[PDB]
């Protein structure tokens, strides 16, 4: 299993422009196009991003490539962060995915503000962390996704994704 699928399942893959939760213009696995409230702008940004006139629609291979870009970017902010870096540094691969899943879900800042839980993860206090994370607004917002992610922190496996 990979990040791709994990995210593919938690965030979802869109092949045509759409309005994220909050309202901006996004595509594929939650790729923000623009903040601007103009479709035309979105289009144009997609086109730049993709390298072809897309007309608001991409192929999956396309969404994948965007995605793998969005990842390494996420990772960089991660590794250029005071709080996240050490934690991440110290996580195992499957466990890193979960952090990344998180970063994607709420951005580098949001994640970096879970002082305690981050601490635990860093400490390798899986259950503690999990229970901790189980009480964030986050968890309450997106329970399913949250439970999956949290379970992964705890278990350190993809098990939570195996039979969906």
Swiss-Prot record:
Substrate binds at residues 32, 104, 117, 132. Changing residue 132 to I: 5-fold decrease in enzymatic activity. Changing residue 30 to A: Almost complete loss of enzymatic activity. Pfam families: Phage_lysozyme (PF00959). It comes from the Viruses. The active site is at 11 (proton donor/acceptor), 20 (proton donor/acceptor). InterPro entries: Endolysin_T4_type, Glyco_hydro_24, Lysozyme-like_dom_sf, Lysozyme_dom_sf, Phage_lysozyme-like, T4-type_lysozyme. Keywords: Antimicrobial, Bacteriolytic enzyme, Cytolysis, Glycosidase, Host cell lysis by virus, Host cytoplasm, Hydrolase, Viral release from host cell. Changing residue 117 to V: 50-fold decrease in enzymatic activity. Changing residue 117 to I: 500-fold decrease in enzymatic activity. It is an enzyme of class 3 (hydrolase). Coiled coil: none annotated. One of its GO terms (biological process) is cell wall macromolecule catabolic process. It catalyses: Hydrolysis of (1->4)-beta-linkages between N-acetylmuramic acid and N-acetyl-D-glucosamine residues in a peptidoglycan and between N-acetyl-D-glucosamine residues in chitodextrins. Optimum pH is 7.3. GO terms for molecular function: lysozyme activity. Its main location: host cell. Belongs to the glycosyl hydrolase 24 family. Endolysin with lysozyme activity that degrades host peptidoglycans and participates with the holin and spanin proteins in the sequential events which lead to the programmed host cell lysis releasing the mature viral particles. Once the holin has permeabilized the host cell membrane, the endolysin can reach the periplasm and break down the peptidoglycan layer. This is Endolysin.
């Amino acid at each position: 299993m990979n990040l791709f699928e994990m995210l593919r399942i938690d965030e979802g893959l869109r092949l045509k422009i759409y309005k994220d939760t909050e309202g901006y213009y996004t595509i594929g696995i939650g790729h923000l196009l623009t903040k601007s409230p103009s479709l035309n702008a979105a289009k144009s940004e997609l086109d730049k991003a993709i390298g072809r006139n897309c007309n608001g629609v991409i192929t999956k291979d396309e969404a994948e490539k965007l995605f793998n870009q969005d990842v390494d970017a996420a990772v960089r902010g991660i590794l250029r962060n005071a709080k996240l870096k050490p934690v991440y540094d110290s996580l195992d691969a499957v466990r890193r995915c979960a952090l990344i899943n998180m970063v994607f879900q709420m951005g580098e800042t949001g994640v970096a503000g879970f002082t305690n839980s981050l601490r635990m993860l860093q400490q390798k206090r899986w259950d503690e962390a999990a229970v901790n994370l189980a009480k964030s607004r986050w968890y309450n917002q997106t329970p399913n996704r949250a439970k999956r992610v949290i379970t992964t922190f705890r278990t350190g496996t993809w098990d939570a994704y195996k039979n969906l």
